[PDB]
Design a protein around this ligand. Structure first.
Ligand SMILES: [Mg+2]
Ligand SMILES: [Zn+2]
Ligand SMILES: [Zn+2]
Lengths: 50, 1336, 98, 79, 49
DNA sequence: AGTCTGACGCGGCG
DNA sequence: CGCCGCGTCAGACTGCA
RNA sequence: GCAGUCUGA
């Protein structure tokens, strides 16, 4: 959706925007799992387990 | 229309001459209906009609009778514009002292009456009497006598005297005195006084009186009896839409006057008691002074805001006065502003301009093209067609801006390249698109910056924008000859990624027919961008005849560099791309292309580089992730070792074996050592990869880590920040600067915990608060430099001079800081450069030393070149184009007409925001030489120097000096002269804490004036047990002990006198205080033995070198060359005496006693040698060693500040400032010229006067040139418009008023003020016609 | 923001400030130096006289731009005359000399 | 089309002279009745003037000679 | 603000020197469209005419 | 002119 | 001890005669 | 037009 420059990271040492980017990916990877289980209409047992 | 500006005091009759009527009533307007009041501050009768061509009463309303005066009301039917030019006047009921000539130190009224200001202020404000005429009594003229001392004088001498008070008294004193007689009376008191402390005041007063009599002024004009009134359209009374009138400040300060004056005019007719008319005259005086300059008398008048009212003198001075706010820079039509955006598809000469902005800026051009093409018939019809934005308006607009440059400007315009002209490409957004390569020149980054766009209207302005200011003409920096259009941080990463190589890349080893096959192989996917490959490459070489010769051969390349060869123009070699191209390699590639091929191939090459770098950085996918910041696995070990060491230091402090000082210092030192080990382990882990080669073996290559590639390219960041991402942040500092002893052992990939982060914030906010407050210092220094140097222009092709400074490579110890090539590239030689094989001229006299001549200098290894410079240039009012050198931005000799002063000031003040706020170990191998030597061969055979200003240098195989050190007094060196040395050898040794006095020739020591207890103490220390003698100090003696000075002398074995070589004066060594001698009397000493021992930056540095400020404790220099002695003593100062062998001998120096005086009674000194150690004052350097030594000193001490931060500035730009500092001279002998003795004159004046006086064989004046700071030399110009617009405006205007000066508009600022073509550049050709058609 | 021509200030006849008042951009002191460092004397003269301060020069320039004649007739800025009046409203006789 | 005047600068060996010569010729073309010596390629009179400068067709000496000739021949048209 | 899917990479110079390159789907989905409300006043005055 | 004032900078320079 | 200076451009909002 | 405040580069 947006393309940012990597050369803005190592000069101004705001590494928190990389880790956030890696967490916001993981935090969305969970969402895309639930979005799958809600579209497969999995049981609430499996949804609750995950 | 006019050729100069004259300024003087205004006669009362002249103020009535300006005036169009007397303002008698303080009423400004009528409140019922808003017409002006009769005789008010706004009056249509006096100041002209209120509407265009209509009378105030309506009886006349059209220009049929223009020029009439109405007779119902007296208003003349003319344009209302005359309300901006017609002045009024208030007839002051009593005289009133002008506050500028009373209070603007020195007080011209005080300096003219020879009367102290603290008493004239008392007489003027009606607190004391003064006697106009004395008469036959003790009532002398300038005597002040208080009122109670006056009424007793009412009877003592009757009414024979007349004493007065107030402005009437001072006006009577001024009007009564005679100038031509008073200056004649003072000229003999000045000529007769021998204490110059009074001669200072005498020549001050004589200068003032001669200035008053030479100009047409009269003294009694410094006391207003008529007050002019500014025209009413310049103090406008704006009607507010809120049903109100918003008043000016002057309209108060005038009304406040017109009341009190009027009130006084009643008390002079009601004959009110003289106490109350005294108080009313005092109020009128202070009201007129509050009008002219508010707050000069302390508490300033404030109206209705509890905020001081604005003066007349507050209108013209300061950052908000007319000069800086409205005259020297002004708001501008045909201009716009927007946010900038990258737009990398652009060509170097064009910029994206929004359609919505380019429709507004180019509006009258569009109206013209609409009326021309018949699409409209009237400017109103075309205005409607444009505001509707019909579809034909855009087709018009695409033509209106076809070849029409626009200027783009991003503030602050720190340097010349801050304004550049591009061709507009109409884009559809609202953001100005700006080519990526010009961002470095602008200092622009796209995080929200804005730019102003200005439109050149005239054909001359469009051609100036196209030929001088277009961005394809500005690819070299004017500060130094290095490219400013340099690929930056994405192009260097693209080309770094392209040009690199990997060991087993896809398609390695194959053989390619050329770059085209490499590109085909890459895009097909059949080979990697890094495949180490053999490509047949054809490269074109410039032969001596000028044309290109092709050479074809199979180069070992990668696929990437072969692909990049397709964009490299013909004349360049292949090795320019056969390497991993960092940032510096790319800027060097562009500089090589500019030097070999010229401007047009380079402007094409830069765009091709930008396009291909962006393309292959995109193809790269170069991305930063959290795994790229690889922390070395030794870190958690290395730290846990230093954490041990501090313990075994702390347990020593708890054991008390160390003090807090060395404990703290050793803890810091071991933490810095651990920091360096961590950063070294990090970088050694990070810069190397292991990859399997074609044979299946392992092999180490340079890493492809993204963080590392951005670091190694020079694209962004550096190992100093890769350290903080992957090493440890290391020791941080306190707010005061004392670095906290436990470091941040954590980096930004790990977390800084809350304490390490809090510590980090100290330095973070120090840096931010430093940046927020040093931009002010940098801008102020830039402005001072511009205003000292604005008027320097190149005005001549050659001044024909032969002198010039000697350029040598700077050497600060073991290493060169700048080679000769950096310091002579672009300069013209002053005298023949001949080969080290003597008398064979390597370079003729007047050549511009371009790159070819410079590498010719370096291969034949010449090391010192005499070079022409602006400080040595013979041209009057300007610089010749040869004494300047190269135009740095172009690369050829400088054009006649360049404003080199503004360029110098900008090139110096632009990097200002980047500045902040014992034996000698020879390093290299070479032949050692000694210079300025006074030496002896000691009894141990080794060399012992007994000079103080001798130096020790190293000479390589080629004859060039590679390193240089300073060998102090008493230094004993273990080598010989001319002796070849290897690396690391210590050559010279000395005692850093003591000076030994050295035997000249062998013989017996013999003590003279050595009476014990009175001059000497024989002592021994229980720790040493050895006997010694110490000479009694000044505190160790009473009167009678200072009288007898101890001494030693050498007496040979027959009891006869031995003589130091060179003269028959005896071999005496006079003993100083606290001289510690270990040796005994009667012993025979040898030549070379030590007789006795005597023990011992940033931006403000540049602002203090240019302001030529005297250091706190200056090094004392020897005033003349001669023989040292000490005449007399102890009245606070010891009187050194240098008696030469020739001329008038006696010279004296009252040197403070406490100052460590490193010279003795017997040795000689030359003119300007150091008598006492310390920082030299620049004035003394100039006085004693010439202008060349002071320009060399200032150039070197400024470049030591700039080189510390990596800043590059060609030092022409510094000499240009020094030339403007030492611009004044002082007459030491008048000669047959008209200048009086000791008077400071302009140097060009006295030099041309000497020229014309030697034209007829007479004697010409002689001078001592001065050195002034940039502020004092700015305020001492011949122009009062260049010095009144700079700063200190009231000083400059009062001194130019009482002097009657004349500004002849010869500078750049004077012509910017008045709206003329500056004499620089494309106005220069104009400004010469104006001279060659008006001087004839 | 952009402005070809608009309202002007009252004492000094220079343009107004800011896109609320239809602006006109300040060609400050450092930009005048940047033009002086080039030889752009004609660009600078038009920035001083006919774009802002000259009151007759700017109308002549507008009619010229419309008429396809890109030529200025620059006179003296109105601020300089304002400065002369303000210095003459002190007791100081500043005067242009021919 | 014109992107750099470096070619026109060697012909008129000064940059502050190129501006004045090119502006004089461009005004001859823009408000005089004069026609370009190079083919007008949809350029402005400034760029046409520079393209004339760089081909040796125009400099201050040629402009002065041509203005002198036209002044004399128009003074000749007096019957 | 909004959660945008960012990639960290240089793209043809459109993210040069702190610039940001946004896909058209961020404009289509109105993710960053904001509403601004301006107050304009028309004050009827009493004038002497 | 009474403040139920403000001051609460700094560094050269003359 | 008093006087003189202490970066540039820009946008917004109040309250004021 | 000014003062105050905030903000941007
Ligand atoms: Mg920015
Ligand atoms: Zn009338
Ligand atoms: Zn010279």
């Amino acid at each position: 959706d947006i393309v940012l420059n990597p050369l803005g990271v190592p000069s101004r040492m705001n590494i928190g925007q990389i880790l956030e980017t890696h967490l916001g990916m993981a935090a969305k990877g969970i969402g895309d799992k639930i979005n799958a289980m809600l579209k497969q209409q999995q049981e609430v047992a499996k949804l609750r387990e995950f | 229309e006019f050729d100069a500006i004259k300024i003087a005091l205004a006669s009362p009759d002249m103020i009535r001459s300006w005036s169009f009527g007397e303002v008698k009533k303080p009423e400004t307007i009528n409140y019922r209906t808003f017409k002006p009041e009769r005789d008010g501050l706004f009056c249509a009768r006096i100041f002209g009609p209120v509407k265009d061509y209509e009378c105030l009463c309506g009886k006349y309303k059209r220009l049929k009778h223009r020029g009439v005066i109405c007779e119902k009301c007296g208003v003349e039917v003319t344009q209302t514009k005359v309300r901006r030019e017609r002045m009024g006047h208030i007839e002051l009921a009593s005289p009133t002292a002008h506050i500028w000539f009373l209070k603007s130190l020195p007080s011209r009224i005080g300096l003219l009456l020879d009367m102290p200001l603290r008493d004239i202020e008392r007489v003027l404000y009606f607190e004391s009497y003064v006697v106009i005429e004395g008469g036959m009594t003790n009532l002398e003229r300038q005597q002040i006598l208080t009122e109670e001392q006056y009424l007793d004088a009412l009877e003592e001498f009757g009414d024979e005297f007349d004493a007065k008070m107030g402005a009437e008294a001072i006006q009577a004193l001024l009007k009564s005195m005679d100038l031509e007689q008073e200056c004649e009376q003072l000229r003999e008191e000045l000529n007769e006084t021998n204490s110059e402390t009074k001669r200072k005041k005498l020549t001050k007063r004589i200068k003032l009186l001669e200035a008053f009599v030479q100009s047409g002024n009269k003294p009694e004009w410094m006391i207003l009896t008529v007050l002019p009134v500014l025209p009413p359209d310049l103090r406008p009374l704006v009607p507010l839409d809120g049903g109100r009138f918003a008043t000016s400040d002057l309209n108060d300060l005038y009304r406040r006057v017109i009341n009190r004056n009027n009130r006084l005019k009643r008390l002079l007719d009601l004959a009110a008691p003289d106490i109350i008319v005294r108080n009313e005259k005092r109020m009128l005086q202070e009201a007129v002074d509050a009008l002219l300059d508010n707050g000069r008398r302390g508490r300033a008048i404030t109206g209705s805001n509890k905020r001081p009212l604005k003066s007349l003198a507050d209108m013209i001075k300061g950052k908000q006065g007319r000069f800086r706010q409205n005259l020297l820079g002004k708001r501008v039509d045909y201009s716009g502003r927007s946010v900038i955006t990258v737009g990398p598809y652009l060509r170097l000469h064009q910029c994206g301009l929004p359609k919505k902005m380019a429709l507004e800026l180019f509006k009258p051009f569009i109206y013209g093209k609409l009326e021309l093409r018949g699409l409209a018939t009237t400017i109103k019809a075309a205005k409607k067609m444009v505001e509707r934005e019909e579809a034909v308006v855009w087709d018009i607009l695409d033509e209106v801006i076809r070849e029409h440059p626009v200027l783009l400007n991003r503030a602050p315009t720190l340097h010349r390249l801050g304004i550049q002209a591009f061709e507009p490409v109409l884009i559809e957004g609202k953001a100005i698109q700006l080519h990526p390569l010009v961002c470095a020149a602008y200092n622009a980054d796209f995080d929200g910056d804005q730019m102003a766009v200005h439109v050149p209207l005239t054909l001359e302005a469009q051609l100036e924008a196209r030929a001088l200011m277009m961005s394809t003409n500005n690819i070299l920096s004017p500060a130094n000859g290095e490219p400013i259009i340099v690929p930056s941080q994405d192009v260097v990463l693209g080309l770094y990624y392209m040009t690199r190589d990997c060991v087993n890349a896809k398609g390695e080893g194959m053989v390619l027919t050329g770059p085209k096959e490499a590109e085909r192989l890459y895009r097909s996917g059949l080979a990697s961008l890094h495949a180490r490959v053999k490509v047949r490459i054809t490269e074109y070489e410039k032969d001596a005849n000028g044309e290109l010769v092709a050479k074809t051969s199979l180069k070992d390349t990668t696929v990437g560099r072969a692909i990049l060869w397709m964009i490299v123009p013909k004349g360049l070699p292949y090795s320019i791309v056969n390497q991993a191209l960092g940032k510096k390699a790319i800027s060097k590639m562009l500089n090589t292309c500019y030097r070999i091929l010229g401007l047009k191939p380079t402007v094409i090459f830069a765009d091709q580089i930008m396009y291909t770098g962006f393309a292959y950085a995109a193809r790269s996918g170069a991305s930063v992730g959290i795994d790229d910041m690889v922390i070395p696995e030794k870190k958690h070990e290395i730290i846990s070792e230093a954490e041990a060491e501090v313990a075994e230091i702390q347990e020593q402090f708890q054991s008390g074996l160390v003090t807090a000082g060395e404990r703290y210092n050793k803890v810091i030192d071991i933490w810095a050592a651990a920091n360096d080990r961590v950063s070294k382990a990090m970088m050694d882990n990070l810069q190397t990869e292991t990859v399997i080669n074609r044979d299946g073996q392992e092999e180490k290559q340079v890493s492809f880590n993204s963080i590392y590639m951005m670091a190694d390219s020079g694209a962004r960041g550096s190992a100093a920040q890769i350290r903080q991402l992957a090493g440890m942040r290391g020791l941080m500092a306190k707010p005061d600067g004392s670095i906290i002893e436990t470091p941040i052992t954590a980096n930004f990939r790990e977390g800084l915990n809350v304490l390490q982060y809090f510590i980090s914030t100290h330095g973070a906010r120090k840096g931010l608060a430093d940046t927020a407050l040093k931009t002010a210092n940098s801008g102020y220094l830039t402005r001072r430099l511009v205003d000292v140097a604005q008027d320097l222009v190149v005005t001549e092709d050659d001044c024909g001079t032969h002198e010039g400074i000697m350029m040598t490579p700077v050497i600060e110890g073991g290493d060169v800081k700048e080679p000769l090539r950096d310091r002579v590239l672009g300069r013209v030689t002053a005298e023949d450069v001949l080969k080290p094989g003597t008398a064979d001229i390597l370079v003729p006299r007047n050549t511009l030393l371009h790159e070819q001549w410079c590498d010719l200098l370096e291969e034949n290894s010449v090391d010192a070149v005499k070079v022409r410079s602006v400080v040595s240039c013979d041209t009057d009012f300007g610089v010749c184009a040869h004494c300047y050198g190269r135009d740095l931005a172009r690369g050829h000799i400088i054009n006649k007409g360049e404003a080199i002063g503004v360029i110098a000031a900008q090139s110096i003040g632009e990097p200002g925001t980047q500045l902040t706020m014992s034996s000698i170990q020879v390093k290299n191998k070479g032949s050692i030489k000694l210079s300025n030597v006074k030496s002896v061969v000691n009894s141990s055979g080794k060399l012992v120097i007994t000079s103080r200003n001798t130096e020790l240098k190293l000479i390589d195989e080629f004859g060039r000096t590679k390193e240089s050190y300073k060998v102090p007094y008493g230094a004993v060196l273990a080598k010989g002269d001319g002796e070849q040395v290897a690396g690391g050898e210590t050559v010279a040794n000395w005692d850093p804490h003591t000076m030994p006095v050295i035997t000249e020739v062998s013989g017996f020591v013999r003590f003279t004036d050595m009476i014990d207890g009175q001059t000497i103490t024989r002592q021994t220390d229980e720790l040493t047990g050895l006997s010694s003698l110490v000479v009694l100090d000044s505190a160790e003696r009473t009167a009678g002990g200072k009288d007898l000075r101890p001494a030693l002398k050498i007496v040979d074995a027959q009891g006869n006198d031995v003589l130091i070589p060179g003269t028959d004066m005896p071999a005496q060594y006079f003993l100083p205080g606290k001289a510690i001698v270990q040796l005994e009397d009667g012993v025979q000493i040898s030549s070379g033995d030590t007789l006795a021992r005597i023990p011992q930056g940033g931006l403000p540095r540049v602002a203090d070198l240019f302001e030529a400020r005297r250091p706190k404790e200056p090094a004392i220099l020897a005033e003349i060359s001669g023989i040292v002695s000490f005449g007399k003593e102890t009245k606070g100062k010891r009187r050194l005496v240098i008696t030469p062998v020739d001329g008038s001998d006696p010279y004296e120096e009252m040197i403070p006693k406490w100052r460590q005086l490193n010279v003795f009674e017997g040795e000689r000194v030359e003119r300007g040698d150091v008598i006492s150690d310390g920082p030299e004052a620049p004035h003394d350097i100039l006085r004693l060693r010439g202008v060349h030594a002071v320009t060399r000193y200032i150039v070197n001490e400024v470049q030591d500040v700039y080189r510390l931060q990596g800043v590059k500035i060609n030092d022409k730009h510094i000499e240009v400032i020094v030339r403007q500092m030492l611009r004044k001279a002082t007459i030491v002998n008048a000669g047959s010229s008209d200048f009086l003795e000791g008077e400071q004159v302009e140097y060009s004046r006295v030099k041309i006067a000497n020229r014309e006086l030697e034209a007829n064989g007479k004697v010409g004046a002689t001078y001592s040139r001065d050195l002034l700071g940039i502020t004092k030399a700015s305020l001492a110009t011949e122009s009062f418009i260049s010095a009144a617009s700079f700063q200190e405006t009231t000083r400059v205007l009062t001194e130019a008023a009482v002097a009657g000066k004349r500004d002849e508009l010869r500078g750049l600022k004077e012509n910017v003020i008045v709206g003329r073509l500056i004499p620089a550049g494309t106005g220069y050709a104009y400004h010469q016609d104006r001279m060659r058609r008006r001087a004839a | 923001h952009a402005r070809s021509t608009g309202s002007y200030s009252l004492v000094t006849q220079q343009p107004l400030g800011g896109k609320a008042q239809f602006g006109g951009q300040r060609f400050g002191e450092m930009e005048v130096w940047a033009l002086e460092a080039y030889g752009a004397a004609y660009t600078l003269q038009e920035m001083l006289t006919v774009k802002s301060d000259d009151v007759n020069g700017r109308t002549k320039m507008y009619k010229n731009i419309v008429d396809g004649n890109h030529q200025m007739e620059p006179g003296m800025p109105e601020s300089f005359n304002v400065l002369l009046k303000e210095i003459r409203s002190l007791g100081i006789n500043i005067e242009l000399e021919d | 089309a014109r992107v750099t005047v470096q070619d026109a600068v060697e012909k008129i060996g000064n940059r502050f002279d190129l501006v004045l010569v090119a502006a004089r010729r461009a005004r001859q073309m823009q408000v005089g009745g004069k026609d370009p010596l190079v083919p007008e390629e949809n350029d402005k009179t400034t760029v046409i003037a520079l393209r004339e400068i760089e081909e040796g067709l125009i400099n201050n000496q040629i402009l002065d000679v041509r203005e002198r000739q036209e002044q004399q021949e128009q003074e000749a048209a007096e019957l | 603000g909004q959660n945008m899917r960012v990639a960290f990479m240089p793209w043809n110079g459109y993210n040069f020197e702190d610039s940001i390159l946004v896909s058209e789907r961020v404009v289509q989905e109105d993710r960053f469209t904001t509403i601004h409300i301006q107050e304009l006043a028309c004050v009827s005055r009493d004038t002497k005419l």
